[PDB]
XYZ file of C-alpha atoms in Angstrom:
580
model
C 5.757 32.703 19.157
C 8.913 34.046 16.911
C 11.977 32.389 15.907
C 14.599 34.256 14.503
C 16.230 33.108 11.033
C 17.633 34.979 7.967
C 15.421 35.664 5.259
C 18.022 35.503 2.819
C 17.971 37.813 -0.750
C 20.908 35.204 -2.366
C 22.736 32.266 -1.522
C 25.679 32.483 0.543
C 28.263 30.120 1.352
C 27.108 29.674 4.617
C 23.863 28.233 3.865
C 25.523 25.136 2.196
C 27.082 23.849 4.978
C 27.443 19.575 5.005
C 25.123 18.871 7.428
C 21.695 20.678 7.113
C 17.991 20.227 7.882
C 16.179 21.243 4.667
C 12.643 22.145 4.058
C 11.645 22.297 0.588
C 7.806 23.218 0.621
C 5.330 22.224 -1.560
C 1.544 23.051 -0.460
C -0.583 21.271 -3.008
C -1.419 17.852 -1.772
C -0.626 16.436 -5.078
C 2.989 17.486 -5.828
C 3.131 16.334 -9.093
C 4.840 19.176 -11.500
C 3.512 21.722 -8.517
C 4.963 24.637 -6.960
C 7.605 24.970 -4.410
C 6.524 28.112 -2.153
C 9.856 28.143 -0.214
C 12.668 26.473 1.358
C 13.975 26.664 4.873
C 17.814 25.852 5.810
C 19.087 25.377 9.110
C 22.521 24.188 9.915
C 25.563 25.199 12.239
C 25.285 28.932 10.940
C 21.682 29.743 11.304
C 18.476 29.698 10.353
C 17.744 30.972 6.584
C 14.551 31.148 4.189
C 15.036 31.188 0.389
C 12.523 32.399 -1.950
C 12.566 29.364 -4.457
C 12.669 31.158 -7.730
C 16.038 32.798 -6.631
C 17.445 29.061 -4.497
C 16.554 27.159 -7.529
C 18.148 29.550 -10.223
C 21.036 29.257 -8.114
C 23.917 27.440 -9.227
C 25.588 26.662 -6.141
C 22.443 25.973 -4.319
C 21.736 23.348 -6.999
C 24.875 22.261 -6.841
C 24.369 21.508 -3.187
C 21.206 19.915 -3.358
C 22.348 17.278 -6.068
C 25.910 16.775 -3.798
C 25.247 13.126 -2.290
C 28.351 14.603 0.657
C 26.200 17.430 1.836
C 23.992 15.836 4.104
C 20.547 16.927 4.861
C 17.667 16.048 7.320
C 14.006 16.304 6.073
C 10.601 15.334 6.476
C 8.608 13.828 3.033
C 11.712 13.886 1.354
C 10.009 11.799 -1.779
C 7.598 14.777 -1.625
C 10.987 17.394 -2.044
C 12.835 15.504 -4.487
C 9.789 14.661 -6.828
C 8.672 18.277 -7.022
C 12.528 19.114 -7.922
C 12.317 16.425 -10.223
C 9.819 17.734 -12.247
C 11.874 20.918 -12.315
C 15.181 18.997 -13.638
C 17.145 19.099 -10.283
C 18.102 16.122 -8.532
C 18.185 16.016 -4.586
C 20.684 13.629 -2.881
C 22.338 13.598 0.546
C 19.120 12.797 2.542
C 20.942 11.135 5.368
C 17.423 11.207 7.451
C 13.652 11.754 6.882
C 11.589 12.480 9.739
C 8.414 11.075 8.277
C 10.051 7.456 7.856
C 11.413 8.024 11.222
C 8.651 8.585 12.851
C 6.787 5.841 10.962
C 8.997 3.123 11.971
C 8.848 4.212 15.831
C 5.056 3.792 15.518
C 3.253 2.940 12.440
C -0.043 3.875 14.735
C 0.575 7.475 14.937
C -0.512 8.841 11.590
C 2.326 11.705 11.387
C 0.202 14.079 8.987
C 3.551 16.807 9.403
C 6.672 18.124 11.507
C 3.951 19.125 14.135
C 2.606 15.758 14.929
C 6.021 13.914 14.776
C 7.858 16.137 17.095
C 4.483 15.639 19.380
C 6.658 12.157 19.862
C 9.252 13.844 21.519
C 7.613 16.626 23.146
C 8.920 19.179 20.828
C 5.761 21.911 20.213
C 7.111 24.745 19.192
C 5.993 24.358 15.394
C 2.710 24.880 14.565
C 0.405 22.147 12.380
C 0.562 22.517 8.592
C -2.945 22.491 8.516
C -2.740 25.501 11.162
C -0.762 27.539 8.842
C -2.163 26.737 5.115
C -5.748 25.756 6.044
C -7.859 22.194 5.293
C -8.858 21.313 2.032
C -10.106 23.992 -0.437
C -8.591 26.782 2.239
C -5.237 25.437 2.168
C -3.755 28.052 0.852
C -0.170 29.512 0.850
C 0.024 33.079 3.439
C 2.379 35.600 3.059
C 6.068 35.536 3.204
C 6.557 36.739 6.428
C 4.041 33.547 8.058
C 4.894 31.448 5.473
C 8.831 31.918 5.995
C 8.605 31.859 9.681
C 6.578 28.268 9.212
C 8.758 26.682 6.999
C 12.036 27.860 9.609
C 10.110 26.607 12.697
C 9.958 23.055 10.720
C 13.422 23.127 9.851
C 14.474 23.745 12.953
C 12.217 20.926 14.505
C 13.597 18.293 12.272
C 17.520 19.451 13.350
C 16.776 19.257 17.287
C 14.320 16.091 16.595
C 17.078 14.209 14.249
C 18.867 12.581 17.277
C 16.528 11.370 19.639
C 14.493 9.860 16.581
C 17.809 7.773 15.689
C 18.724 6.693 19.468
C 14.762 5.678 19.778
C 15.629 3.780 16.340
C 18.495 2.190 17.529
C 17.326 1.022 21.092
C 14.866 -0.787 19.061
C 17.294 -2.160 16.340
C 15.262 -0.146 13.907
C 18.334 1.780 12.534
C 19.164 -0.183 9.315
C 15.464 -0.700 9.100
C 15.464 3.394 8.138
C 18.946 3.981 6.291
C 19.064 1.066 4.354
C 15.746 -0.323 3.996
C 12.979 2.664 3.962
C 15.199 5.704 2.720
C 16.939 4.155 -0.333
C 13.347 2.923 -1.330
C 11.924 6.548 -0.776
C 14.255 7.561 -3.693
C 13.489 4.540 -5.776
C 9.652 5.117 -5.027
C 10.127 8.811 -6.116
C 11.810 7.400 -9.528
C 8.757 5.736 -10.091
C 6.196 8.022 -9.217
C 8.240 10.627 -11.672
C 8.619 8.617 -14.481
C 4.844 7.702 -14.297
C 2.929 5.348 -16.225
C 1.293 5.833 -19.790
C -2.186 4.837 -20.257
C -4.101 4.090 -23.211
C -6.831 6.379 -22.879
C -8.562 5.076 -25.930
C -8.939 1.380 -24.712
C -9.732 3.061 -21.233
C -12.759 5.341 -23.005
C -14.061 1.721 -24.841
C -13.784 -0.392 -21.755
C -15.847 2.477 -20.020
C -18.194 2.386 -22.707
C -18.771 -1.231 -22.600
C -19.075 -0.999 -19.079
C -21.464 1.710 -19.158
C -23.541 -0.405 -21.423
C -22.833 -3.370 -19.152
C -24.701 -0.995 -16.044
C -27.980 -0.339 -18.591
C -28.721 -3.921 -18.660
C -28.287 -4.919 -15.042
C -30.392 -1.575 -13.529
C -33.239 -2.163 -16.791
C -32.941 -6.069 -15.360
C -33.482 -4.487 -11.669
C -36.461 -2.309 -12.720
C -38.097 -5.074 -14.703
C -37.798 -7.287 -11.578
C -38.701 -4.636 -9.299
C -41.557 -3.631 -11.570
C -40.687 0.232 -11.578
C -38.080 2.066 -12.163
C -36.421 3.725 -8.973
C -33.275 5.263 -8.020
C -30.908 2.212 -7.389
C -28.772 4.592 -5.138
C -31.333 5.830 -3.071
C -31.091 3.459 0.407
C -34.552 4.853 1.322
C -36.171 4.219 -2.113
C -33.960 0.540 -2.537
C -35.322 -0.550 0.719
C -38.908 0.245 -0.001
C -38.761 -1.632 -3.056
C -36.955 -4.998 -1.065
C -38.855 -4.805 2.090
C -42.383 -3.255 1.369
C -43.088 -3.589 -2.862
C -41.429 -7.304 -3.302
C -41.983 -7.753 0.933
C -38.959 -9.605 1.715
C -38.036 -10.124 5.014
C -36.361 -7.814 7.204
C -33.175 -9.746 8.447
C -32.500 -7.178 11.549
C -34.130 -3.838 12.224
C -32.763 -0.790 12.064
C -33.858 2.126 13.880
C -34.730 3.947 11.129
C -36.204 2.856 7.473
C -34.350 -0.468 6.261
C -30.456 -1.103 6.053
C -29.618 -2.074 2.613
C -26.095 -2.693 3.521
C -23.969 -5.121 1.470
C -24.144 -7.701 4.510
C -27.887 -7.729 4.449
C -27.922 -7.836 0.678
C -25.837 -10.967 0.401
C -28.029 -12.856 3.588
C -31.163 -11.561 1.292
C -29.807 -12.934 -2.016
C -31.757 -16.532 -1.618
C -34.964 -14.503 -1.392
C -35.251 -12.759 -4.863
C -33.174 -12.204 -7.850
C -33.379 -9.106 -7.730
C -30.888 -8.746 -4.659
C -27.715 -10.314 -6.830
C -28.609 -7.611 -9.658
C -28.308 -4.925 -6.978
C -25.139 -6.090 -5.923
C -23.784 -6.959 -9.436
C -24.776 -3.106 -10.383
C -23.598 -1.492 -7.103
C -19.748 -3.466 -8.182
C -19.877 -2.347 -11.964
C -21.153 1.561 -10.347
C -18.224 1.434 -7.936
C -15.612 -0.210 -10.712
C -16.929 2.806 -13.415
C -16.397 5.729 -10.803
C -12.845 5.019 -9.545
C -11.012 2.890 -12.571
C -13.038 4.840 -15.623
C -14.015 8.244 -14.374
C -11.747 8.887 -11.538
C -8.394 7.280 -13.408
C -9.329 9.142 -16.443
C -9.182 12.447 -14.182
C -5.512 11.741 -13.326
C -4.163 10.999 -16.825
C -1.953 14.161 -17.921
C -3.872 15.856 -20.819
C -0.174 16.309 -22.659
C 1.632 13.140 -21.557
C -1.353 10.640 -21.381
C 0.290 9.447 -18.160
C -0.626 8.828 -14.433
C 1.983 9.711 -11.647
C 1.202 7.861 -8.493
C 1.615 8.454 -5.329
C 2.691 6.115 -2.770
C 2.300 6.807 0.824
C 5.947 5.180 2.400
C 4.245 6.083 5.838
C 0.757 5.025 6.255
C -0.291 0.857 6.863
C 0.706 -0.513 9.947
C 1.653 -3.674 8.226
C 4.579 -1.850 6.728
C 2.775 -2.512 2.944
C 3.370 -0.101 0.619
C -0.010 2.181 -0.443
C -0.766 4.454 -3.075
C -3.179 6.770 -4.410
C -4.395 9.235 -7.396
C -4.331 6.682 -8.971
C -4.956 3.880 -6.204
C -4.037 0.573 -8.772
C -3.510 -1.774 -5.823
C -7.481 -1.673 -5.343
C -8.081 -2.558 -9.219
C -10.741 -5.156 -8.534
C -9.519 -8.166 -9.852
C -12.625 -10.809 -8.748
C -14.662 -8.424 -11.473
C -13.368 -9.435 -15.130
C -14.467 -5.832 -16.185
C -11.856 -5.320 -12.800
C -9.031 -6.950 -14.344
C -9.437 -5.859 -17.453
C -8.865 -2.269 -16.493
C -5.107 -3.230 -16.056
C -4.885 -3.290 -20.500
C -5.027 0.400 -20.370
C -1.608 1.053 -18.725
C 1.049 0.477 -21.572
C 5.007 1.096 -21.948
C 5.713 4.528 -22.534
C 8.339 4.152 -25.844
C 7.696 2.528 -29.009
C 8.925 -0.879 -29.119
C 9.032 -1.275 -25.379
C 7.132 -3.985 -22.945
C 5.529 -4.145 -19.626
C 7.377 -6.922 -17.638
C 5.562 -8.076 -14.198
C 6.852 -10.729 -11.283
C 4.957 -11.641 -8.743
C 5.707 -13.774 -5.740
C 3.247 -16.821 -5.517
C 2.481 -17.346 -2.060
C 4.845 -15.169 -0.206
C 2.799 -14.982 2.891
C 1.948 -18.499 3.273
C 5.854 -18.949 2.921
C 6.690 -16.451 5.026
C 4.309 -18.096 7.483
C 5.959 -21.359 7.136
C 9.209 -20.088 7.614
C 8.632 -18.131 10.879
C 6.107 -21.043 12.614
C 8.903 -22.974 11.253
C 6.001 -25.868 10.674
C 7.446 -28.741 9.382
C 4.456 -30.088 6.967
C 4.426 -26.600 5.701
C 7.745 -26.583 5.223
C 8.079 -29.531 3.529
C 4.867 -28.771 1.181
C 6.806 -25.623 -0.092
C 9.986 -27.660 -0.934
C 8.020 -29.854 -2.758
C 6.483 -27.376 -4.425
C 3.412 -28.452 -3.837
C -0.190 -26.673 -4.901
C -0.822 -25.483 -1.209
C -4.437 -25.521 -1.430
C -4.742 -29.189 -2.787
C -2.276 -29.942 0.037
C -4.426 -28.114 2.624
C -7.408 -29.876 1.541
C -6.060 -33.538 1.739
C -5.096 -33.203 5.290
C -7.663 -31.226 6.512
C -10.349 -33.258 4.591
C -8.425 -36.370 4.834
C -8.180 -37.493 1.337
C -5.799 -38.362 -1.657
C -4.856 -35.993 -4.055
C -6.695 -37.503 -6.625
C -9.798 -37.208 -4.169
C -9.889 -33.262 -3.539
C -12.800 -31.999 -5.752
C -12.696 -28.273 -6.930
C -14.982 -27.789 -4.216
C -12.561 -29.050 -1.572
C -9.778 -27.033 -2.803
C -11.831 -23.443 -2.928
C -12.514 -24.118 1.032
C -9.195 -25.315 1.825
C -7.791 -22.190 -0.202
C -10.118 -19.787 1.937
C -8.903 -21.539 5.223
C -5.197 -21.069 4.469
C -5.856 -17.396 3.619
C -7.944 -17.434 7.100
C -5.265 -18.700 8.731
C -3.129 -15.840 7.187
C -5.179 -13.619 8.283
C -5.694 -14.678 12.026
C -9.306 -14.946 11.196
C -12.524 -16.130 13.973
C -14.102 -18.772 13.347
C -17.156 -16.264 12.784
C -15.406 -14.490 10.130
C -14.051 -17.964 7.911
C -17.778 -19.017 8.501
C -18.820 -15.789 6.829
C -16.347 -16.191 3.989
C -17.361 -19.776 3.301
C -21.341 -18.781 4.110
C -21.066 -22.223 6.377
C -21.907 -21.962 10.287
C -19.428 -21.296 12.821
C -19.493 -24.669 14.077
C -18.405 -26.328 10.748
C -15.675 -23.090 9.827
C -14.065 -23.712 13.895
C -14.050 -26.957 13.073
C -11.892 -26.746 9.599
C -9.764 -24.557 11.680
C -9.109 -27.430 14.239
C -8.164 -29.571 11.831
C -6.272 -27.401 10.073
C -4.106 -26.634 13.198
C -4.062 -30.614 13.868
C -2.179 -31.080 10.401
C 0.046 -27.851 10.852
C 0.897 -28.150 14.569
C 4.049 -25.444 14.170
C 1.646 -22.704 12.814
C -0.888 -23.554 15.849
C 1.790 -23.660 18.114
C 2.866 -19.906 16.426
C -0.393 -18.137 16.721
C -0.690 -19.096 19.733
C 2.906 -17.892 20.901
C 2.460 -15.183 18.776
C -0.213 -13.841 20.856
C 1.125 -14.239 24.381
C 3.983 -12.352 22.920
C 2.270 -9.574 21.953
C 1.073 -9.601 25.487
C 4.254 -9.746 26.832
C 6.208 -7.090 24.889
C 3.281 -4.686 24.029
C 3.754 -5.170 20.109
C 4.713 -7.527 17.473
C 7.683 -7.135 14.793
C 8.825 -8.649 11.411
C 11.726 -10.190 9.813
C 13.341 -6.409 9.397
C 12.375 -5.652 12.809
C 9.604 -3.321 11.897
C 7.337 -3.288 15.108
C 3.482 -2.453 15.740
C 2.266 -1.679 19.001
C -0.787 -3.124 20.181
C -1.937 -1.523 23.332
C -5.548 -2.505 22.765
C -4.780 -6.174 23.417
C -5.590 -5.754 27.133
C -9.100 -3.833 26.484
C -12.021 -6.060 28.096
C -14.005 -5.592 24.953
C -14.177 -8.409 23.112
C -14.262 -6.658 19.533
C -11.315 -4.481 20.197
C -9.068 -7.429 22.374
C -9.781 -9.404 19.300
C -8.858 -7.088 16.785
C -5.488 -6.660 18.382
C -4.844 -10.399 19.036
C -5.982 -10.381 15.185
C -2.811 -8.404 14.449
C -0.597 -9.872 16.304
C -1.157 -12.861 14.326
C -1.406 -11.058 10.896
C 1.542 -8.197 11.119
C 4.336 -10.519 11.594
C 3.577 -12.132 8.431
C 2.329 -9.571 5.957
C 5.124 -7.253 7.382
C 8.151 -9.902 6.472
C 6.539 -9.979 2.920
C 6.351 -6.555 2.833
C 9.926 -6.161 4.330
C 11.160 -8.799 1.617
C 8.982 -6.556 -1.461
C 10.795 -3.563 -0.412
C 14.567 -5.149 -0.160
C 13.512 -6.983 -3.764
C 13.172 -3.573 -5.058
C 16.073 -1.886 -3.772
C 18.028 -4.825 -5.213
C 16.346 -4.739 -7.921
C 16.998 -1.282 -8.963
C 20.849 -1.733 -8.404
C 21.371 -4.698 -10.366
C 19.433 -3.269 -13.528
C 21.847 -0.698 -13.196
C 25.263 -2.993 -13.151
C 23.619 -4.879 -15.845
C 23.055 -1.537 -18.051
C 19.550 -1.982 -18.833
C 17.501 0.833 -18.706
C 14.211 -0.997 -18.038
C 12.914 0.877 -14.634
C 10.341 -0.027 -11.777
C 7.226 1.622 -12.514
C 4.338 0.408 -10.082
C 4.213 -2.297 -6.786
C 1.078 -3.500 -6.436
C -0.024 -6.562 -3.672
C 3.168 -8.970 -4.287
C 3.831 -7.955 -7.504
C 6.794 -5.398 -8.905
C 5.725 -3.812 -12.522
C 8.977 -2.500 -14.739
C 8.798 -1.133 -18.507
C 11.603 -1.373 -20.481
C 13.233 -1.813 -24.424
C 11.763 -4.976 -26.073
C 15.680 -6.274 -26.405
C 15.916 -6.427 -22.735
C 12.696 -9.073 -21.774
C 15.369 -11.897 -22.492
C 17.573 -10.732 -19.982
C 14.668 -9.405 -17.432
C 13.226 -12.807 -17.510
C 16.534 -14.298 -15.604
C 17.785 -11.339 -13.756
C 13.882 -10.153 -11.933
C 12.998 -13.188 -10.913
C 16.537 -14.073 -9.432
C 17.051 -10.478 -7.443
C 13.454 -11.508 -6.107
C 14.098 -14.878 -5.266
C 17.256 -13.666 -3.364
C 16.099 -10.972 -2.035
C 16.005 -12.762 1.644
C 16.878 -16.202 2.526
C 14.033 -18.150 4.476
C 13.751 -21.852 5.251
C 11.589 -22.024 2.204
C 12.262 -20.803 -1.592
C 10.799 -18.060 -2.670
C 8.836 -18.757 -5.942
C 8.173 -15.669 -8.429
C 5.802 -15.878 -11.581
C 6.549 -13.244 -14.297
C 6.043 -12.386 -17.857
C 5.877 -9.617 -20.332
C 3.274 -8.603 -22.786
C 2.030 -5.223 -24.910
C -0.207 -3.885 -21.659
C 0.086 -4.746 -17.824
C -2.987 -6.907 -18.570
C -0.775 -8.960 -20.975
C 1.952 -9.124 -18.938
C 0.555 -12.477 -17.531
């Protein structure tokens, strides 16, 4: 299996044509400040492999990379863009990214590499990266001959697959989704990742100190309630303490030992006070491991910055995902969890963090999509939506809504959006299945448009095979025809939830693109740093705050026009935590 190409020793004008498939290979999984091991270029003139040291030191080549008029087709261009940003080289003109095209054609695929995407179109003349490099630790660059051929086959595949992918995207009415949304966003994400976020390691270490102190106490406490010390993290030792020493009841028999899962422990809670201590201890432990120890681990020793990597092609909802660190999973139910946000500070003196968040964007999207008169009117009145749901559902006046009622109505609102089952809600509210089902029925009685939407979207998913979002993102649901109840239910739940969550993701993405552009038209140097949940996080000189207070919400509120207003809450402060 050998494909022909020129193992070039110098850059030639031939390699700089105005349309090419380009491969700028970074083998390290985390591409920040990582090595570029080789370059492959395929165009109308042939196939070329270029040694990095040579290519990247060539003025004409670098000029070609940054020339927006020289079009490039790539796979995961953000990875190459960032790797080059760290070398002071700007990559421009990427008009087609195979990874994002594959992601939009079928987010369920999991397209890890060029080989995976190619398989989508019966193209197999390229090997999977893992085959060439190895897995995890073995992931090592091979000798020039083997590396050169792989990169060339990867470039050759992109060159061939561009048209068939664009044709299907066009068929699907997703051509603009790729060109106007996902691709432009990819460049913005690269800028964000490259910029990084400064971390106050002194504050983080102090928080970790306090955390360890807190853990020591709940642990000592558990030991006191157990009457002895034991490895709390040993499921075997724990099971013995709970179900033999303390003689708590075994809720559901397991083939081996006893189960001490969070679910069982939650159900065991009413039997002994040691149970809640253990659950708390586990939470605190998980916070320490990922947000004290794990975070400190990815802070650059020199700049004290953290450079997240967004995975723009992971979720089947369309929402962004990030890792190393994964800042979207900072536990905000836990006080010690939300404070972790105090560790993220401006990257320059006299700068501040500005954070803007969409309020109830998913419910507002549901109101729009379902065209539910009652829900639309509520948002048009800017009512507290949870108090309103409680009023309807429990049939009381606003004055009669108690904190407990609002909390339960809040859970119901989230459940409806989630496409939750009576059993799922029952679990969330710690009530029976019949009681939760009753809440859902009263909800659909008060919100008939939402009821009709939920019913109809499931049958549409059955008829078409997929559901779509505001900007035409699609999610195929082959499992929906399964006779297995859990499998089928899961799919039906996705038919209900995806158009809502996905449309919210579409809006946030468009807002980021519009915002990036407006900030430049307004001559501000403020820039995006992070995107988490329904929040956009930026940093900027203190002198730009007043202008940002008007600009950010305006851009976000105007990203898309719905049947109800899009509400934004915004604040700024000296830390991320304080920008609230």
